[PDB]
Design a protein around this ligand. Structure first.
Ligand SMILES: CC1=C(/C=C/C(C)=C/C=C/C(C)=C/C=C/C=C(C)/C=C/C=C(C)/C=C/C2=C(C)C(=O)CCC2(C)C)C(C)(C)CCC1
Ligand SMILES: CC1=C(/C=C/C(C)=C/C=C/C(C)=C/C=C/C=C(C)/C=C/C=C(C)/C=C/C2=C(C)C(=O)CCC2(C)C)C(C)(C)CCC1
Lengths: 304, 302
């Protein structure tokens, strides 16, 4: 068993690879078209889905950068946004790249509010997308909400020129914690994984892993080793709600066990308004430690 | 005008972005599935489309790596190929990454022949692709040949974790052909096409502004004469550009923008694959190339 070979467990699992396909098409676009397309997608999505407000701490971390942009003239504001989209090498792009995804998202949330108000240069009036851009937006608007928000998030995270993160919130009080139930699955490691993540208890969660174990987020390469996985939990995985439904348990090579669970996950950005269809694919060693876990965004509810 | 803003000229040009979409899907796959998928695509494509043999110089440059793999036991051979697909950090992967695209392609051409012959571990008998991988292969097989070969090339180039073929002397001046483009007599555009068709990179590069850029299909702009010239020498030998028609318009600051459409042949396939291409030029007032983008078009309808 290697981490990279483990990526192949449960090969029947149909991931929503339209997401990275769409991000790839988006990434080809002219920067102004990238910005306008997201503006359009954002505006129309906002008619039925409300984005949660960025946290106070996140806003403080992005404040300096936001103030600099607000102080610029309109042409310069537009240029700064194009710089981010083009991944140009500028001080602002370097600052942006140092930020965790949540801080990047909160930065754009605020710019969006300011553009709506006319305090930061808006997308030009009557702007029409390029041929390729119009098709990309059409694709996005045809996707399930869980896929739409993943496309938008990944586009945002990709910006800037490549560590600052929000403070780590204390774990949930033990007596207040809920426990998940999974049809077919009573495996203690899997249950403890879900329960500890739901309680933001990253120190306990990381102890479930082998020293060389990995976690693979949707459409990303495996994050390998306890140090890197713990960093990822602390920077990116706060305040999720995992709602696993059902699973299946099978023996693997060398006394290992492989378990696939399907269910839903909510991000604090949208709460119960977007339930993403997710699979977890675990490979556990003979002692029950996590050697590998992959988290996949599923192609449709037909994959649960 | 910035290089990055110039990327937006002629915005109704519909590029074949199914190519980078498909590469992105492919890149998500398990490595063994990546290898099997390409094996399948390769085998089926080869029933109607023959790949030209790698050049002698290229083969010599890849020879040591190929010999090392051939000396391995079958399990190790399979692992070595998986390492390349996974972009693992290994000596072989580092050597591979140092190679120009043509050398990487020739390396896999040879491994393909050896797998067919049974001298390098083949894809396991009766191998079945994953759900996601089967769909990716279906997409590829539905594409026009020019798009298929671009997907395969880009997948190959992406593998692994400063070595190029020797530069071939430019074509004898008296032997050179000249292109004709309906609607377009612009000397810079004509000289661009004619010099590239003659492998005359030293003359070609002089058409560019010092800070000018060239943007290959689905890649970021390559900026400045040093980098553009390097790209010509490493990657752009022995092409055949067959421009057909164009359109010429004024641009800002006394600049001119010109779009040309036509076909291009790669020496890997010759006339057997004609790729539908657009060139989008932005020329300064003196006629120098500030920006040229080369796009693979979505269909002949473009
Ligand atoms: C840019 C831009 C603009 C603003 C755009 C904005 C404002 C976009 C905001 C988008 C947001 C807020 C998207 C949030 C999406 C969040 C998602 C998709 C979270 C998914 C998390 C999951 C699936 C986690 C699953 C996990 C599990 C279950 C595990 O078991 C282990 C950990 C982990 C893997 C993490 C404007 C409009 C100005 C126009 C100009 C350009
Ligand atoms: C991996 C692998 C295998 C072998 C795969 C092989 C063997 C694949 C070979 C593929 C090849 C040989 C593809 C070649 C494609 C070449 C292309 C698509 C060239 C396009 C060039 C263009 C469009 C240039 C246009 C330009 C123009 C016109 C300009 O004006 C400026 C310059 C430039 C921009 C360059 C096997 C089976 C073992 C299985 C295991 C894994």
């Amino acid at each position: 068993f290697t981490i990279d070979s483990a990526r192949g467990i449960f090969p029947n699992t149909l991931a929503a690879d339209v997401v990275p396909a769409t991000i790839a098409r988006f990434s080809q676009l002219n920067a102004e078209d990238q910005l306008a397309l997201i503006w359009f997608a954002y505006l129309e999505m906002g008619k039925t889905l409300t984005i949660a407000a960025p946290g106070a701490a996140s806003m403080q971390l992005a404040e300096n950068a936001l103030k600099e942009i607000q102080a610029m003239g309109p042409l310069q504001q537009t240029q700064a946004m194009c710089d981010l989209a083009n991944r140009a090498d500028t001080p602002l792009c370097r600052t942006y790249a140092s930020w965790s995804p949540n801080i990047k998202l909160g930065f754009w949330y605020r710019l969006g509010e300011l553009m709506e108000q006319g305090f930061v240069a808006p997308i030009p009036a009557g702007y029409q997308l390029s041929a390729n851009a119009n098709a990309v937006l059409a694709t996005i608007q045809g996707l399930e909400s869980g896929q739409q928000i993943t496309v938008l998030r990944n586009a945002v995270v990709d910006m800037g020129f490549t560590r600052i993160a929000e403070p780590v919130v204390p774990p949930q009080d033990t007596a207040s914690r809920t426990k998940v139930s999974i049809e077919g699955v009573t495996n203690a490691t899997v249950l403890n994984y879900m329960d500890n993540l739901n309680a933001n208890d990253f120190d306990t969660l990381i102890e479930l892993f082998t020293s060389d174990g990995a976690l693979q987020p949707p459409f990303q390469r495996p994050i390998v080793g306890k140090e890197n996985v713990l960093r990822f939990f602390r920077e990116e995985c706060q305040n999720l709600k995992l709602i696993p439904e059902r699973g299946v348990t099978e023996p693997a090579e060398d006394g290992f066990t492989q378990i696939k669970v399907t269910g839903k996950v909510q991000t604090p950005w949208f709460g119960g308004n977007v339930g993403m269809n997710i699979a977890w694919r675990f490979l556990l060693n003979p002692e029950g430690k996590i050697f590998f876990v992959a988290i996949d965004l599923l192609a449709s509810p037909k994959e649960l």
